[PDB]
Structure 1
Amino acid sequence: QPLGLSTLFMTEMWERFSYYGMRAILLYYMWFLISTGDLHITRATAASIMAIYASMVYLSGTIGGFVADRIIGARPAVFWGGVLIMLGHIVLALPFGASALFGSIILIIIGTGFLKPNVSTLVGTLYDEHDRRRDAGFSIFVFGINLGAFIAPLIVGAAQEAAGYHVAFSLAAIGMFIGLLVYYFGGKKTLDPHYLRPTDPEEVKPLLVKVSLAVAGFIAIIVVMNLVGWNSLPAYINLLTIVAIAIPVFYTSTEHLRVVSYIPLFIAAVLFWAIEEQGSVVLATFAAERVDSSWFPVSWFQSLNPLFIMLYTPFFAWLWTSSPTKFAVGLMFAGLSFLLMAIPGALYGTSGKVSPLWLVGSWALVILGEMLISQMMSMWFLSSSVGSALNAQLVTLYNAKSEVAYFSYFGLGSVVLGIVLVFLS
């Protein structure tokens, strides 16, 4: 392959290492912060923070593509996105409390928004239009993402149990630092100079007005919230949820139908991502509260997701050699992954603790579902943003008392809507 893939492989390997490493202990960290009185929220609110955090990272991602192509360039977008992210982890390793969560979260949200769509763009830039190495090349790139995502919970989770949260977060910072270094020294060797600048720059003033109007409305909204007395943390989370959902909602005989025909497909994607992103929130809660797991860090369950991706990837590749049907069966598997998790609780009760194989099977199903499910790329991140945004409301409903009903009701609900969608194909 081109020498430049090595640089980008490790760069992405290390950014996702940093991201999912942080994600694997962050909910437990907030639980920790609550118990010590630094964070005055319920565990439900802490869970809600995890969901909207992921959600905003995805939402943030739909703009960075715009910013790179038109303003700062894909390569500077990646570097400075990475710098902000590295700063995001640095903020969390300091002996601060809630004041660092948010500062960190904002840094990482913005930083990841810059990096994710743009590293993917640069991967494309390695190849000519007709260069055949492309499918293989993108596959190798994706393996690095999963590999980093796989090893990260293992390493950071172990550090957390052994040496505490702060040390664990510092490993994530070092991981991102390594990525920036490799990206930087490797980039000057192999990456095309063209992407140091924007490819599609009288539009500068209007863009300023457009961004400003969205932000000005947003700040005024926060003011009014504080005036009506809807200025609690859950209230602010409600604002971000509404924003994340309104963006897609606001967005002839035959023609009109096609655009309309896509609506059920988008909802399927949203609902799948809702379920898939709950892996790092609700199942993490289930793992820590309902499972017998003394010989390894419970955060390690988060490694099962990319493991199954790596395990599934070569099989489906052989297999494929319609799309709405893929969405449908994919959503059904997501529903099945939750229906499955309802079984141990219903049979034995929720007061005791159960075997780890239930979570293995759940992830087995949802990633199975995942194997089935420039313009379309941002649409992909909104599917996940809205899904995670949807999660920000639902996960506050999860506790030991609601465990079985939560998995079953919403599980069957997903299967049924999947049944509605298969039919519409």
Structure 2
Amino acid sequence: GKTFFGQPLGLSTLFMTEMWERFSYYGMRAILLYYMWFLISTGDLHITRATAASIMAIYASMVYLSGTIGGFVADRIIGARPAVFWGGVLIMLGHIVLALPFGASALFGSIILIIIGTGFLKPNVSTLVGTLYDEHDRRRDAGFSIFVFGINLGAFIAPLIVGAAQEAAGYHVAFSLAAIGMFIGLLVYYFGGKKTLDPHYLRPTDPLAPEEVKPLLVKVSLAVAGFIAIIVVMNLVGWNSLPAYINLLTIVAIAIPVFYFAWMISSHLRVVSYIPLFIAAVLFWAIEEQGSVVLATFAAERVDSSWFPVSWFQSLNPLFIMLYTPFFAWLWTAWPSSPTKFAVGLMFAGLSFLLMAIPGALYGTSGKVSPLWLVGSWALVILGEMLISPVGLSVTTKLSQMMSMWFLSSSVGSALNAQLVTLYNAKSEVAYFSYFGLGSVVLGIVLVFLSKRIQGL
């Protein structure tokens, strides 16, 4: 029978939908920080570079958090297929906003649009992949792997294409390419979906019952009122700078999992066992998410890249994932506990940062070093990713609220980054990499020691 790599044909539509959406997202990620440096350098945007770095991290943190809500809105209110569509429209508008002839004044609107749009789309394209398969279809794992390959393909080519356009034709043209990529995704998604997706998913599959509407409304309104209350009090007492708002969002992103732990623990052994795994994932993702902030800074300031666009380094994360997956797929069938995998994963992340301490220690920080240092850094952190990422969902489910905590681990890690990356600068380079690299190796060794008990729990 006709398939797409052995899978139902609908996977082709969803593969390309996600590939082009990830193209738009990671094309933006690869130039947004440099764009803020440019807006800063012309006096248009009145922040420090450290705040610009902080923004990048909390942006990612909010995007991951937003994805924790989009499943519910689709399943219970609008349906999965319209969530992916309108989510894509919002993503597209978010890039259009940065393509328009504005400067710093458009940044917040773009960020809000992409936060909301990505939160609608990302959980719900993954849902639709599952809908391709009946309950006990054994292809299900294979289809999701092919899907993830589409994600990485889009992440790989976007910095190449969008980053080259940015240097040749300017930031506005480059962001317009991100919007067009999403537009392409919407075209394939809309017309391909009708031919291959079940019309059942045009509507919520668990619509709010009559008595559930009001409690939901009350709960949302109380949250909005509380948040706005905190913001007026912040402005009355004079905590109204941009870093003050970033600290508020940091606190919110960390509090949400902390309150969930307190809920489950006080309302038991397995849950206690998950604290060190969640912390290990948080720290892994912190380092991994710094590729686009701290390593991107290092790439622009300290690497000799005179002959190629410096945003291209952002292709190495997905490149290594793609290159490594055959070897790791063979390893998991030829061959370790998940707590051991997390600990070794954190150690590789720590090594990836220790490695970057060497060129400044050996050559000084005033010159430029070879791109191969960053190539080796991403090689190491992605090695850890191959250990932690394929199992993270599994371990957290082996042990609904908590299922979402796996996805929150990368939001918390990015929120931690919003604080940490403000410490990175030309003068702190070597100590920053040394401290956080060694610190992550040491905690990886701690988790190794704890790995047996956790295995029991």
Q: Which interval holds the TM-score relative to the shorter structure?
A: over 0.9
Q: Deviations over 1:154-192 (max 9, x none)?
A: 000000110010000000000000101111011111001
Secondary structure of 1:351's counterpart equals coil
Which of the numbers 312, 317, 321 marks the counterpart of 1:300? 312
Compare 379-388 and 277-286 and name the one that shifted more.
379-388
Distance in 2, matches of 1:33 and 1:224, equals 30
Alignment of 1:406 with 2:415, yes or no, is: no
Distance in 1, matches of 2:16 and 2:78, equals 23
> How far is 1:65 from its partner?
1.1
The answer on whether the counterparts of 1:18 and 1:172 sit within 8 Å (CA) in structure 2 is: yes
Distance in 2, matches of 1:44 and 1:370, equals 26
Alignment of 1:362 with 2:377, yes or no, is: yes
Alignment of 1:376 with 2:406, yes or no, is: no
Distance in 1, matches of 2:313 and 2:403, equals 29
Distance in 2, matches of 1:316 and 1:279, equals 22
Q: Deviations over 1:111-143 (max 9, x none)?
A: 001111111111011001111222221111111
Question: Cα 1:177–1:377, aligned 2, differ >3 Å: closer, same or farther?
Answer: farther
Secondary structure of 1:37's counterpart equals coil
Compare 37-46 and 376-385 and name the one that shifted more.
376-385
Distance in 2, matches of 1:299 and 1:378, equals 32
Compare 137-146 and 279-288 and name the one that shifted more.
137-146
The answer on whether the counterparts of 1:273 and 1:383 sit within 8 Å (CA) in structure 2 is: yes
> How far is 1:36 from its partner?
1.2
Q: Deviations over 1:88-124 (max 9, x none)?
A: 0011101111221100000000000111111111101
> How far is 1:380 from its partner?
2.4
Distance in 2, matches of 1:395 and 1:34, equals 18
Alignment of 1:115 with 2:121, yes or no, is: yes
Compare 295-304 and 197-206 and name the one that shifted more.
197-206
> How far is 1:255 from its partner?
10
The answer on whether the counterparts of 1:24 and 1:302 sit within 8 Å (CA) in structure 2 is: yes
Q: Deviations over 1:322-370 (max 9, x none)?
A: 1111100000000000011101111111111111111000000000000
Distance in 2, matches of 1:243 and 1:375, equals 16
> How far is 1:375 from its partner?
5.3
> How far is 1:257 from its partner?
2.3
Q: Deviations over 1:266-311 (max 9, x none)?
A: 0000001100000000000000000111111000000011000000
Which residue in 1 is equivalent to 2:81? 75
The answer on whether the counterparts of 1:61 and 1:378 sit within 8 Å (CA) in structure 2 is: no
Secondary structure of 1:296's counterpart equals coil
> How far is 1:24 from its partner?
0.1
Which of the numbers 289, 296, 304 marks the counterpart of 1:277? 289
Which residue in 2 is equivalent to 1:17? 23
Compare 197-206 and 31-40 and name the one that shifted more.
197-206
Secondary structure of 1:52's counterpart equals helix
Compare 168-177 and 60-69 and name the one that shifted more.
60-69
Distance in 2, matches of 1:294 and 1:98, equals 28
Which residue in 1 is equivalent to 2:46? 40
Distance in 2, matches of 1:264 and 1:376, equals 14
Distance in 1, matches of 2:127 and 2:401, equals 12
Distance in 2, matches of 1:358 and 1:82, equals 36
> How far is 1:69 from its partner?
1.2
Query: What RMSD in Å do the two structures reach over aligned CA positions?
Result: 1.3
Distance in 2, matches of 1:11 and 1:232, equals 38
Distance in 2, matches of 1:357 and 1:310, equals 19
Which residue in 2 is equivalent to 1:263? 275
4+ runs deviating over 6 angstroms = none
Distance in 1, matches of 2:414 and 2:169, equals 31
> How far is 1:378 from its partner?
2.2
Secondary structure of 1:371's counterpart equals helix
Q: Deviations over 1:204-239 (max 9, x none)?
A: 110111111111100111111110111011111111
Distance in 2, matches of 1:278 and 1:147, equals 20
TM-score scaled by length of structure 1: 0.98
Question: Cα 1:78–1:87, aligned 2, differ >3 Å: closer, same or farther?
Answer: same
Q: Which runs of 5+ in 2 are unaligned?
A: 1-6, 261-265, 389-399, 452-457
Distance in 2, matches of 1:318 and 1:134, equals 18
Question: Cα 1:153–1:47, aligned 2, differ >3 Å: closer, same or farther?
Answer: same
Alignment of 1:141 with 2:170, yes or no, is: no
Distance in 2, matches of 1:384 and 1:132, equals 29
Distance in 1, matches of 2:190 and 2:443, equals 46
Distance in 2, matches of 1:404 and 1:380, equals 31
Secondary structure of 1:203's counterpart equals helix
Q: Deviations over 1:56-76 (max 9, x none)?
A: 000111011111111111111
Distance in 2, matches of 1:93 and 1:422, equals 48
Which residue in 2 is equivalent to 1:227? 236
Distance in 2, matches of 1:41 and 1:255, equals 44
Distance in 2, matches of 1:38 and 1:236, equals 20
Q: Deviations over 1:374-409 (max 9, x none)?
A: 656522221000000000000000001100000011
Which of the numbers 175, 184, 203 marks the counterpart of 2:190? 184
Distance in 2, matches of 1:114 and 1:326, equals 31
Q: Percent identity?
A: 100
Q: Which runs of 5+ in 1 are unaligned?
A: none
Distance in 2, matches of 1:160 and 1:231, equals 33
Secondary structure of 2:36's counterpart equals helix
Secondary structure of 1:350's counterpart equals coil
The answer on whether the counterparts of 1:85 and 1:107 sit within 8 Å (CA) in structure 2 is: yes
> How far is 1:3 from its partner?
1.5
Compare 94-103 and 152-161 and name the one that shifted more.
94-103
Distance in 1, matches of 2:199 and 2:350, equals 46
Distance in 2, matches of 1:47 and 1:397, equals 10
